[PDB]
Amino acid sequence: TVASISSGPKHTQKVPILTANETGATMPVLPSDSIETRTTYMHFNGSETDVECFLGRAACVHVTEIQNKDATGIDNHREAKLFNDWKINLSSLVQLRKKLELFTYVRFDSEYTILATASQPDSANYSSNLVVQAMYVPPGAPNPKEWDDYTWQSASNPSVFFKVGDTSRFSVPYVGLASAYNCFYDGYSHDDAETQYGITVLNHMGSMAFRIVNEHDEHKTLVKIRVYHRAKHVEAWIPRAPRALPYTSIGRTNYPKNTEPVIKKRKGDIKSY
């Protein structure tokens, strides 16, 4: 492939460099339309800018935490982090968010990796070996109330059991309702006068729930869960302007008030170098 062809002096009536940008086109002008060039080859394919590659590496999408401790006398397991949940969403963390929001609709399978590490902030004789249980409560499913409920039975709910310190991994098809995931949605659930606005109304795919299978030892053990997400088989439509201001909420476009100028002011003139 040639990156530049050889081109010499020109004295024409045919001027490729004068255009009318009002038309909305970006005319494909090249170095050889306005200087004299020599042949050179590309030596490159643009492999690593493919959208599959761009969205295809694992990104941290969520960090939660649960603890193993005596539940005796706990009136609210959920509240004691005897077990937590993550109401599946990819808008939490902004690193992967900005990347995704470069497009309007996106379609992909997900591969999740879940790393779990334990901490024992206060005096323990040892490090126990705990087994985590991650179960996906599809919307319209009995939500775990306790840490050893009947829900954890998950007889129809896909669940994975792995050891703390270890990692769990699996992949999920694209479980979108539509033909693709809406990165943006300028509409509402229904024609109400108070109903929410955005995608937060469209992206209601239940939540994930973690818990430690093991009973309690004499000390307490903090287990912190990190969920990583990798898109595989990516398809993206309609590019948009990149995010400039900071994010404030999962699912709304809102930016913070009295934010700071995002364009760097010159130290000098327009004329400055």
Binding site: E22, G187, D191, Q196, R252, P256
Partner: protein, 255 residues
Amino acid sequence: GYSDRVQQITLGNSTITTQEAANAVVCYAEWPEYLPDVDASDVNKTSKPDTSVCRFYTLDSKTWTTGSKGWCWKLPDALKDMGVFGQNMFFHSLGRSGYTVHVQCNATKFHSGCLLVVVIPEHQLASHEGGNVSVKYTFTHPGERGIDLSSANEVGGPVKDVVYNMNGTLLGNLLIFPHQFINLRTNNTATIVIPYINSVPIDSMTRHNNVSLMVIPIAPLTVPTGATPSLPITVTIAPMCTEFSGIRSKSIVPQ
């Protein structure tokens, strides 16, 4: 003697002529078309009013003055009240449509000024409150009036800051969306053909707007000496290939 410059668009029972055009944009290089069976889901036969809905509606005019910040209309909202297009809209459960948008602004060879005319698929607005305040329905359904970016923040309304596109992105990059400029010195109209763009084959016309049309002054209007300091901008829009499905009782929407 054909120029890129003169054009005629006849759609239904209405025709537009421009003698100072700058080509026309067809979003994503695709022209509006009906919904193919292979893509269909709802089993209902659809209704295609054709020429009674696919004609040109001219919205009320705006006034560009030296202080203007820009205006924003949503589709199909802007047309919610135009003739039979609008009736069909409130009466069917689902509908689908593409449009021809023609924005008009003429001046003289002594004026200067340049407007950006852009179509943004799925333009989800931001609340000026920040945090996770929502933007109430009425605020994103201004109707033919559209939203005036130089109007004041209101409560439950969107933010109207231009250099952020009403969503946290910079004005400068709106050029990645199908758009055309109106530069008084060149141009006097802008025309964009919009194919139907959605993640579902057909949708509700009232709970979801699928494009915002935005006209934004970028190089300020500058009139000749002792000229009146303003020009009107007119927007005429025509639904094209419209289909309605799931007819019934007639939606009632807030406000």
